[PDB]
Scaffold this active site. Structure first.
Site, PDB file in Angstrom:
ATOM      1  N   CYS A  59     -17.382   8.338 -54.289  1.00  0.00           N
ATOM      2  CA  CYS A  59     -17.950   9.692 -54.358  1.00  0.00           C
ATOM      3  C   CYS A  59     -19.431   9.566 -54.649  1.00  0.00           C
ATOM      4  CB  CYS A  59     -17.278  10.539 -55.460  1.00  0.00           C
ATOM      5  SG  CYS A  59     -16.961   9.731 -57.078  1.00  0.00           S
ATOM      6  N   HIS A  78     -21.632  11.901 -64.726  1.00  0.00           N
ATOM      7  CA  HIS A  78     -20.446  12.240 -63.948  1.00  0.00           C
ATOM      8  C   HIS A  78     -19.347  13.036 -64.651  1.00  0.00           C
ATOM      9  CE1 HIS A  78     -18.146  11.709 -60.297  1.00  0.00           C
ATOM     10  NE2 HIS A  78     -17.156  11.097 -60.921  1.00  0.00           N
TER      11      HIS A  78
HETATM   12  N1  LIG Z   1     -11.161  13.873 -56.838  1.00  0.00           N
HETATM   13  C1  LIG Z   1     -12.234  13.167 -57.157  1.00  0.00           C
HETATM   14  O1  LIG Z   1     -13.062  13.540 -57.986  1.00  0.00           O
HETATM   15  C2  LIG Z   1     -12.437  11.851 -56.452  1.00  0.00           C
HETATM   16  C3  LIG Z   1     -13.693  11.455 -56.023  1.00  0.00           C
HETATM   17  C4  LIG Z   1     -13.795  10.499 -55.046  1.00  0.00           C
HETATM   18  C5  LIG Z   1     -12.700   9.721 -54.773  1.00  0.00           C
HETATM   19  N2  LIG Z   1     -11.561   9.867 -55.477  1.00  0.00           N
HETATM   20  C6  LIG Z   1     -10.563   8.764 -55.483  1.00  0.00           C
HETATM   21  O2  LIG Z   1      -9.287   9.284 -55.168  1.00  0.00           O
HETATM   22  C7  LIG Z   1      -8.279   8.390 -55.688  1.00  0.00           C
HETATM   23  C8  LIG Z   1      -7.098   9.197 -56.171  1.00  0.00           C
HETATM   24  O3  LIG Z   1      -7.379   9.715 -57.494  1.00  0.00           O
HETATM   25  P1  LIG Z   1      -7.187  11.284 -57.758  1.00  0.00           P
HETATM   26  O4  LIG Z   1      -8.395  11.823 -58.450  1.00  0.00           O
HETATM   27  O5  LIG Z   1      -6.753  11.947 -56.494  1.00  0.00           O
HETATM   28  O6  LIG Z   1      -5.963  11.250 -58.794  1.00  0.00           O
HETATM   29  P2  LIG Z   1      -4.533  11.971 -58.857  1.00  0.00           P
HETATM   30  O7  LIG Z   1      -3.713  11.323 -59.923  1.00  0.00           O
HETATM   31  O8  LIG Z   1      -4.752  13.446 -58.938  1.00  0.00           O
HETATM   32  O9  LIG Z   1      -3.930  11.596 -57.419  1.00  0.00           O
HETATM   33  C9  LIG Z   1      -3.007  10.486 -57.302  1.00  0.00           C
HETATM   34  C10 LIG Z   1      -1.896  10.866 -56.355  1.00  0.00           C
HETATM   35  O10 LIG Z   1      -1.316   9.660 -55.796  1.00  0.00           O
HETATM   36  C11 LIG Z   1       0.082   9.671 -55.975  1.00  0.00           C
HETATM   37  N3  LIG Z   1       0.522   8.295 -56.160  1.00  0.00           N
HETATM   38  C12 LIG Z   1       0.230   7.476 -57.222  1.00  0.00           C
HETATM   39  N4  LIG Z   1       0.759   6.284 -57.115  1.00  0.00           N
HETATM   40  C13 LIG Z   1       1.437   6.314 -55.906  1.00  0.00           C
HETATM   41  C14 LIG Z   1       2.200   5.347 -55.224  1.00  0.00           C
HETATM   42  N5  LIG Z   1       2.416   4.117 -55.681  1.00  0.00           N
HETATM   43  N6  LIG Z   1       2.735   5.704 -54.033  1.00  0.00           N
HETATM   44  C15 LIG Z   1       2.516   6.943 -53.579  1.00  0.00           C
HETATM   45  N7  LIG Z   1       1.820   7.932 -54.129  1.00  0.00           N
HETATM   46  C16 LIG Z   1       1.299   7.550 -55.307  1.00  0.00           C
HETATM   47  C17 LIG Z   1       0.336  10.566 -57.182  1.00  0.00           C
HETATM   48  O11 LIG Z   1       1.647  11.089 -57.169  1.00  0.00           O
HETATM   49  C18 LIG Z   1      -0.724  11.648 -56.965  1.00  0.00           C
HETATM   50  O12 LIG Z   1      -0.237  12.641 -56.071  1.00  0.00           O
HETATM   51  C19 LIG Z   1      -8.985   7.519 -56.741  1.00  0.00           C
HETATM   52  O13 LIG Z   1      -9.132   6.184 -56.278  1.00  0.00           O
HETATM   53  C20 LIG Z   1     -10.364   8.174 -56.869  1.00  0.00           C
HETATM   54  O14 LIG Z   1     -11.393   7.246 -57.176  1.00  0.00           O
HETATM   55  C21 LIG Z   1     -11.353  11.012 -56.212  1.00  0.00           C
END
Ligand SMILES: NC(=O)c1ccc[n+]([C@@H]2O[C@H](COP(=O)([O-])OP(=O)(O)OC[C@H]3O[C@@H](n4cnc5c(N)ncnc54)[C@H](O)[C@@H]3O)[C@@H](O)[C@H]2O)c1
Ligand SMILES: NC(=O)c1ccc[n+]([C@@H]2O[C@H](COP(=O)([O-])OP(=O)(O)OC[C@H]3O[C@@H](n4cnc5c(N)ncnc54)[C@H](O)[C@@H]3O)[C@@H](O)[C@H]2O)c1
Ligand SMILES: NC(=O)c1ccc[n+]([C@@H]2O[C@H](COP(=O)([O-])OP(=O)(O)OC[C@H]3O[C@@H](n4cnc5c(N)ncnc54)[C@H](O)[C@@H]3O)[C@@H](O)[C@H]2O)c1
Ligand SMILES: NC(=O)c1ccc[n+]([C@@H]2O[C@H](COP(=O)([O-])OP(=O)(O)OC[C@H]3O[C@@H](n4cnc5c(N)ncnc54)[C@H](O)[C@@H]3O)[C@@H](O)[C@H]2O)c1
Lengths: 337, 339, 339, 337
Positions: free
Chosen positions: C155, C182
């Site tokens: 991000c 952040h």
């Molecule tokens: N939202 C943000 O601010 C943001 C910014 C940039 C990138 N990201 C990246 O997105 C990624 C996800 O994090 P998030 O913020 O969405 O968290 P989150 O916990 O909200 O999302 C995780 C999701 O993945 C699923 N999951 C977890 N382990 C799993 C598995 N083994 N098999 C299948 N599904 C599985 C969970 O059930 C959940 O739905 C991270 O690597 C983060 O760095 C998020």
């Protein structure tokens, strides 16, 4: 058809203006805005809101004493003393008093002097003043009243569904507690205040403060005089609040019967004011909600057949504004002189 | 030994009084406060504080204008116009001007006209007539007869200066920029409302808020050699107290490594700045610096030199407590250098 | 046209789906989600979002595994082991791996083994496996047949890269440091509890929390010329979304002034980066950048050159929405460059 | 004397350990700590707390499987499955189960298997288990019980002063609502959960969730079975919560009489557990408060002579821990073999 003047372009001042812009064919017409702040201040904050989010419309600083909203031009003045405002010069028919200071006969009146015709106080009235809660007794209004208060954000929530209860189960007595978002009134950091509670952190505490909405109900529902009373808790949230009513009715009743009654009214008479919601939600899920009160059905519970508890959400800013507009919306109708 | 008055009983002023109470044996002696709220509003807030927590000591309301902290009385008056103040009547020797209004010569001086001997501003002076001191750096530069109005600088400047010195004084600071993730403050709006700075007018509690800051330039006021070489912004983030500075000055010296830059601090920390500077190697977070007596603390593990010449440091400082503690040292000075 | 699966229905994954819905006419077509919670838990959270607000459209639960967004169905399965996924059965063409677990070749590829054609990671690779793209910078570098596993970077990196380019490509970046205030994230503890990083283990909501970040180095992955020249830390502050970067690179070129540095952006903003970069001259605050389609926005009034060579910039980027929007552009690419 | 083992070095695990360190001549003696986290994790967080603040004591990481606190050494192990923990090997007489998972016969039992003698569950017990609330029925305890629960943070508050009410005015029926600080259980950002409410933002909303403390009261005050029941509101605060009880008693009563009764008990029988406070304070002003419940006198109000509302503060973390310790403090006394 009705010239309006917004005095106190604060949270309710702006939440209102915008609430208005969204209405179709509005008997209301804003022309002047008075706030301690310059044209810059009025523009910026009408456009960029930290709670309603950026305003969808073109808002520029047209003039030295005006601002533009989608072309519609509005004057911005600034006198800490109302009497001076050119209400008479501009033929101000209605003034939306949202400053928080002019809540009494004497104060709100200075608007009349300035040449204004009517003064709608965006808060409870102090002393002898007509209090109306759209949906609870707006028929009590008459073009005769020169100064009316649209009650508080809380009362405007608690009232609608209280009417429903009493008008169906008979409220004997009952307390209530409103977990409320904080407001401009609180101190951001432990600082002096006439309410040593409100004087505290605001964002770091649950601040018990008192509310009038308790007795104010009776103001609009004459029947409950001295039957209701409660406190309030200011918790770390910028908006949307919930009320926890607890009345004892005569007619023995049960959980779903109560909720039912609510829905019925919400679908008929109170359609647009009250409403129910089964989907298990939370604060934030109730922003920009045009209704005054929203019952969290799944939470409603009864005890010993006569003690009823009802939780109810409401957007203390928007929903109220929408009421304020609806009230002013009324003054425009049933207006003779 | 010396009578002290506190004009402005809010955060910094109250943080002052507290700092002073539990102390070795300060020559200072608070005998009056000017809180526009009476003994009630002034007591309550000294006893119960959301950021420091309930004050540990019997605080009772004697008279209708005289509370007491463990027996020792403290007369309390109230009036926005210093001129009406009983400074002379009471015979006030030092006045801790902590309101943020009287920060120019004419203003802060109104206290002298009332009968005050010396005035210390708990903020940067708006004049040019007034000396800016920063315990640890150039406190010596203060001697009786030399101006009866001084400024203990800024919370930020008092956190920067110290370790900024050690940097230039032992590595040579070419010039650099800086940022400061700062805990929101009273001057900010609680909710979006009118304010002369459309940034501060935004919900202090729900925004990262960029706002100018001279704290950078003012470093010079105490460290001339840097005059017009530093500079930067500030960011307000939803955290009631304790802030951090992010200095990025590309050095003049060789191209030293990280951990040695540190050692300089560490050296100058347990040496000349024992009580002002300090280096914490253990990875903590803001909340762990509440009530920190050090005017500045560097996060060891965060320091890092980039291109041999560019050094980057991060320091921790409690803006309320820390500053207030220095303000008691700077008032402690005045008394140790008094006829 | 092209069938898309979303593995990981959380913030970024849901932010994705949202981004995609209200769109021109993306060649993409989400037909399945893998949220370990069923249609209920997966629906609710798509409809009611604390940071984006109630989703504007009829979202109903059809079947026991098939909700629908305005009539258009979306089959929903759940299993931690991609191998058991019906990618082949459904004929999934693209998979948006947004879990933060499968970020290495072996892992993310488990989706291919299940029957997936191409896999896009919504985060930085788990090692030296897989390319890293950043729409606006080096998206061209992607062409079918060239690896079936890509990473849309970070991000932060996706906010930096863009304007980092314009800096070097039109001023020459010698080298510099950077910081990023952040918004806290899911990987942080709500209250002080066990966590592999004693910094993230602290109350995400009540601390300024320093935590390493590669986002700085990774810039190279897309801008080789800078390889090993940038770097920095990150500070978590009590703000659920929208963050800011504080870049401090002392330039190579002459010693240009402030407002011209800007103009470069402004120029490259309405030009090659129309949709990625942008410059906002009006003084706002974080909350004003919610739902911002620009991968990076510079605060005009904040930019400032110090010693002719040292430039300092500050950019605004919605970490949830923005990134998710690029992630839909990068998945939009794959389809436009498909047989 | 009595060897203790802390399983689940979380918030209550640590808030406990520390609560203990402060007691003089404690029949308890911590010797082993089991948490999914390594010695590093145990050290750091025992020393640096974001709510209790840095711990005043020397805390170093002495050992590969131990930590030191002012010299007293303690072993730190880590098995996600209890049965393995060397409770028998170390002669563990008591285990403080604060993990939040092992709340049932089956689960808590795995501790007994590991060789442990007793298991104090720092939460309400699920199923048929002895529930005791220090001050409300600790005499019900007998060395015979191998598994006991010290009830919830809420119940431990609401109970004490409920006893006072009923035992004096007779509680007929009544609801209650607890405005509660958030806890590890909530999601920091809209994420999956079995309680789509608790699954929400946590820090940006008032999250209505349900609580057992309602019926749990009856668990320890047999008399109120099915007379009480309420919900809870999770507001943006890391600690200290307030309960809003609303009971209907038989004996007509008035404002100050109620409060009086409270004080009386608070000065005699409940001395150390309940307490009153007139000084108008707020959340934060109640951190580290050794008592279980604190009545906000100035808030107490009565209606129609029989409907009483009482607000009460309590440190859901510290105050509870102090109870947990007091319970274990008891098990050590009245312990035979
Ligand atoms: N939202 C943000 O601010 C943001 C910014 C940039 C990138 N990201 C990246 O997105 C990624 C996800 O994090 P998030 O913020 O969405 O968290 P989150 O916990 O909200 O999302 C995780 C999701 O993945 C699923 N999951 C977890 N382990 C799993 C598995 N083994 N098999 C299948 N599904 C599985 C969970 O059930 C959940 O739905 C991270 O690597 C983060 O760095 C998020
Ligand atoms: N927001 C709510 O929850 C809500 C809803 C119902 C009632 N109310 C009440 O309505 C009142 C209006 O306050 P608000 O919610 O708009 O917030 P606010 O405090 O921001 O509004 C007050 C505004 O009026 C301006 N003002 C004050 N004195 C003035 C004067 N003499 N001339 C011109 N402008 C002046 C102030 O500068 C400020 O912008 C308050 O008393 C509030 O308690 C608030
Ligand atoms: N504690 C901190 O956060 C902190 C940090 C460093 C320095 N400071 C500086 O200290 C100054 C004080 O502000 P604060 O943050 O303590 O806010 P504050 O509002 O809590 O303190 C101001 C106090 O001064 C009083 N006051 C205001 N105008 C007055 C007048 N005309 N006459 C008499 N008393 C008056 C107020 O009643 C109040 O008691 C500011 O300039 C601030 O920058 C504060
Ligand atoms: N904090 C409160 O307000 C409060 C007060 C009363 C009741 N409780 C109870 O306290 C208990 C602990 O919750 P908490 O508030 O301390 O939060 P928490 O989540 O921080 O505590 C749980 C801890 O247990 C550890 N753990 C989990 N499984 C384990 C296992 N198999 N072996 C060893 N350690 C394990 C986790 O690593 C974590 O550190 C729960 O039963 C909760 O219901 C909470």
């Amino acid at each position: 058809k009705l010239k309006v003047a917004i005095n106190g372009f604060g949270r309710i001042g702006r939440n209102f203006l915008r609430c208005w812009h969204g209405r179709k064919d509005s008997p209301l017409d804003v022309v002047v805005i008075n706030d301690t702040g310059g044209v810059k201040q009025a523009s910026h904050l009408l456009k960029y809101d930290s709670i309603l989010g950026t305003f969808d419309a073109d808002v520029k600083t047209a003039g030295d004493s005006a601002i533009s909203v989608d072309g519609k031009v509005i004057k911005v003045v600034s006198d800490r003393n109302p009497v001076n405002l050119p209400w008479g010069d501009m033929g101000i028919d209605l003034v939306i008093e949202g400053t928080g200071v002019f809540v009494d006969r004497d104060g709100a009146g200075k608007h009349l002097q300035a040449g204004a015709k009517k003064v709608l106080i965006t808060a409870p009235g102090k002393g002898d003043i007509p209090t109306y809660v759209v949906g609870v007794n707006e028929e009590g209004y008459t073009h005769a009243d020169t100064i009316i208060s649209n009650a508080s954000c809380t009362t405007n929530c608690l009232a609608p569904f209280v009417k429903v209860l009493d008008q169906k189960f008979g409220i004997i007595k009952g307390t209530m507690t409103t977990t409320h978002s904080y407001t401009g009134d609180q101190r951001l950091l432990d600082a002096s205040h006439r309410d040593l509670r409100r004087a505290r952190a605001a964002c770091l505490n649950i601040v018990p403060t008192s509310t009038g909405a308790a007795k104010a109900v009776a103001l609009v529902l004459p029947n409950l005089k001295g039957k209701l009373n409660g406190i309030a808790l200011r918790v770390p949230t910028p908006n949307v609040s919930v009320v926890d009513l607890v009345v004892q009715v005569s007619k023995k009743t049960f959980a779903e019967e109560v909720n039912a009654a609510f829905r019925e009214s919400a679908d008929n008479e109170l359609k647009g004011i009250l409403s129910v919601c089964d989907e298990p939600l939370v604060s934030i899920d109730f922003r920009c909600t045009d209704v005054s009160s929203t019952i969290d059905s799944s939470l409603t519970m009864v005890m010993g057949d006569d003690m009823v508890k009802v939780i109810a959400w409401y957007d203390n800013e928007w929903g109220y504004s929408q009421r304020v507009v609806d009230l002013a919306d009324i003054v425009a109708n049933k207006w003779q002189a | 030994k010396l009578k002290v008055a506190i004009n402005g009983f809010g955060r910094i002023g109250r943080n002052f009084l507290r700092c002073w109470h539990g102390r070795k044996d300060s020559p200072l002696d608070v005998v009056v406060v000017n809180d526009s709220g009476g003994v009630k509003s002034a007591t309550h807030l000294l006893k119960y504080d959301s950021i420091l927590g309930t004050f540990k000591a019997d605080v009772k309301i004697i008279d209708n204008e005289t509370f007491s902290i463990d027996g020792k009385p403290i007369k309390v008056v109230s009036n926005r116009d210093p001129l009406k103040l009983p400074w002379a009547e009471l015979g006030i020797d030092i006045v801790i001007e902590g309101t943020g209004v009287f920060v120019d010569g004419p203003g802060a001086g109104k206290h002298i006209q009332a009968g005050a001997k010396k005035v210390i501003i708990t903020a940067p002076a708006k004049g040019s007539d007034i000396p800016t001191y920063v315990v640890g750096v150039n406190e010596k530069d203060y001697g009786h007869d030399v101006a009866n109005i001084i400024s203990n600088a800024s919370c930020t400047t008092n956190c920067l200066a110290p370790f900024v010195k050690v940097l230039d004084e032992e590595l040579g600071i070419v010039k650099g920029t800086m940022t400061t993730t700062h805990s929101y403050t009273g001057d900010q709006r609680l909710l979006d409302a009118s304010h002369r700075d459309l940034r501060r007018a935004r919900a202090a509690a729900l925004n990262i808020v960029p706002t100018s800051t001279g704290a950078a330039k003012a470093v010079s006021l105490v460290l001339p050699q840097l005059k017009g070489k530093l500079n930067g912004i500030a960011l307000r983030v939803p955290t009631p107290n304790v802030s951090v500075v992010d200095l990025v000055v590309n050095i003049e010296k060789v191209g030293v490594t990280a951990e040695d830059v540190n050692n300089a601090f560490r050296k100058a920390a347990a040496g000349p700045l024992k009580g002002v500077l300090d280096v914490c190697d253990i990875p903590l977070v803001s909340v762990d610096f509440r009530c920190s007596d050090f005017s500045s603390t560097i996060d060891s593990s965060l320091t890092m030199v980039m291109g041999g010449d560019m050094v980057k440091v991060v320091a921790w400082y409690d803006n309320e407590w820390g500053y207030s503690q220095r303000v008691v040292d700077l008032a402690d000075l005045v008394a140790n250098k008094w006829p």
